[PDB]
Design a binder for this molecule. Structure first.
Ligand SMILES: OC[C@H]1O[C@H](O[C@H]2[C@H](O)[C@@H](O)[C@@H](O)O[C@@H]2CO)[C@H](O)[C@@H](O)[C@@H]1O
Lengths: 20, 469
């Protein structure tokens, strides 16, 4: 629940980083 | 006993000096007229949070400090208010064990650690290593004895072996225990547990052995060694077994690392007797005479009171306790400790009984514990924490050859030296990151952050941070 939502968000954040 | 204004009910574990504590209670009653009832219910550490809200708790609860952070998070403890003069009477590290989110939440009483206890008549020289125990048992079986028996039902007793080669509860990083970083299923924990399960497999120990079984077999002279705390010394004294107390054996050359407990006394938030409880604890129990009375019943270990500890320190059994304590680690007091212990308890029981392989049992324990811990932080909270870090970076950026600070969507990079690899610890505010790792950038000779060949992208390496994902 919380963990899934949070990790999913981080993977998308890790990807913005990669795009930076 | 039920709570009543003008009297004290105290709970303490049945292995501790509850009769000595009741003598302290008797003196308190003589002096003040306040009657003190000492009880020792089974599973008192689980019972307390279950019954406190109904008014069925004690005024004062004694337990090792590890359970108290959980009680404090649940609003079950009164704040304690020792003045500076009082606090100065106890060792600072004992106060540290009862500090939670910057508040003192209990009074420390004594420092406990497991040691190796051995029968000198059966075994004049105790083994230095776990590895030599199997052959020692083989030799002893031939004479109708066994090498070693200890409580296999409680993970407290098996932990020192699990931890020896690398098992850990929580990693301490960035000024706190990191509940994302759990060390229950690593190679070290698996090595230690395998060694234990092998002892059972090979009939050097029995999976069903509990505290009472082990205690009786040692005290009857049936087994050459046991593993236990200072509280157990009294019964051994009574049995007239010729015993010594020593450093735990090493595993793979490494010390066994017992989890160190500080027996502590907390006051129930629901007690109408908080001022009496304070008077009893500070002025009666935490004195040379109060601790001596409890200690003469069942030894406390290294007491938190400096004046009395200075006497007890000359006892070779206390010297061995402190030796094992230094090789071990103080338990965290974080609320997550009970879940940690539950996971390890189940893992050890399952491995020892053959229900699971070692790897399955610890993987499951790690998985189940982590499932609980990883559920705490909402996405909303995690966004808020990153936003706070962003606003901090934007402050740093407004205040600005070496490479320059910039925000990359997750972390604020600092100055980078010309022509250098820049390493930044994986940020604390990202819950799921590995916090013993670093993220990396490269700074040009020209003072610009290194780019990705054929891209406008800035090079960064966060592979260490994402270790857990
Ligand atoms: O086995 C897990 C258990 O370990 C510790 O309990 C110890 C306690 O600290 C000692 O004073 C003595 O009573 O033995 C106990 C083990 O049976 C933790 O304090 C406890 O929270 C944990 O559940």
């Amino acid at each position: 629940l919380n963990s899934m939502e949070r990790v999913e968000w981080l993977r998308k954040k890790l990807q913005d980083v990669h795009n930076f | 006993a039920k709570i009543e204004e003008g009297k004290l009910v105290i709970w303490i574990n049945g292995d501790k000096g509850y009769n000595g504590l009741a003598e302290v209670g008797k003196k308190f009653e003589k002096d003040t007229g306040i009657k003190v009832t000492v009880e020792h219910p089974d599973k008192l550490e689980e019972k307390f949070p279950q019954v406190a809200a109904t008014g069925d708790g004690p005024d004062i609860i004694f337990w090792a400090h590890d359970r108290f952070g959980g009680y404090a998070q649940s609003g079950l403890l009164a704040e304690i208010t020792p003045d500076k003069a009082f606090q100065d009477k106890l060792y600072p590290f004992t106060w540290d064990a009862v500090r939670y989110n910057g508040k003192l939440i209990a009074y420390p009483i004594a420092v406990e650690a497991l040691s190796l206890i051995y029968n000198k008549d059966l075994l004049p020289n105790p083994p230095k290593t776990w590895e030599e125990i199997p052959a020692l048992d083989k030799e002893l079986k031939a004479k109708g004895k066994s090498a070693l028996m200890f409580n296999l039902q409680e993970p407290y007793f098996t932990w020192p072996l699990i931890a020896a080669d690398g098992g850990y509860a929580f990693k301490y990083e960035n000024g706190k225990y990191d509940i994302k970083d759990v060390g229950v299923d690593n190679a070290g924990a698996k090595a230690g547990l395998t060694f234990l399960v092998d002892l059972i497999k090979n009939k050097h120990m029995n999976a069903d052995t509990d505290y009472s079984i082990a205690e009786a077999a040692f005290n009857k002279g049936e087994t050459a060694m046991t593993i236990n705390g200072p509280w157990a010394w009294s019964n051994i004294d009574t049995s007239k077994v010729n015993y010594g107390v020593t450093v735990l054996p090493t595993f793979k050359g490494q010390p066994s690392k017992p989890f160190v407990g500080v027996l502590s006394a907390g006051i129930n938030a629901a007690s109408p007797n908080k001022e009496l409880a304070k008077e009893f604890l500070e002025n009666y129990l935490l004195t040379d005479e109060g601790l001596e009375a409890v200690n003469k019943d069942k030894p406390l270990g290294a007491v938190a009171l400096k004046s009395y500890e200075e006497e007890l320190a000359k006892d070779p059994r206390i010297a061995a306790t402190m030796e094992n304590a230094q090789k071990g680690e103080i338990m965290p007091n974080i609320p997550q400790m009970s879940a940690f212990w539950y996971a390890v308890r189940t893992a050890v029981i399952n491995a020892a009984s053959g229900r699971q392989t070692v790897d399955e049992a610890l993987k499951d324990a790690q998985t189940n514990a982590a499932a609980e811990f990883d559920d705490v932080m909402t996405k909303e909270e995690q966004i808020f924490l990153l936003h706070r870090a962003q606003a901090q970076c934007e402050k740093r950026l407004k205040e600005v050859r070496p490479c320059l600070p910039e925000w990359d969507h997750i972390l604020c990079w600092p100055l980078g030296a010309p022509g250098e690899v820049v390493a930044v610890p994986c940020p604390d505010y990202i819950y799921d990151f590995n916090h013993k790792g670093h993220a990396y950038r490269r700074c040009d000779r020209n003072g610009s952050w290194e780019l990705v060949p054929g891209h406008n992208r800035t090079w960064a390496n966060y592979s260490e941070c994402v270790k857990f994902l």
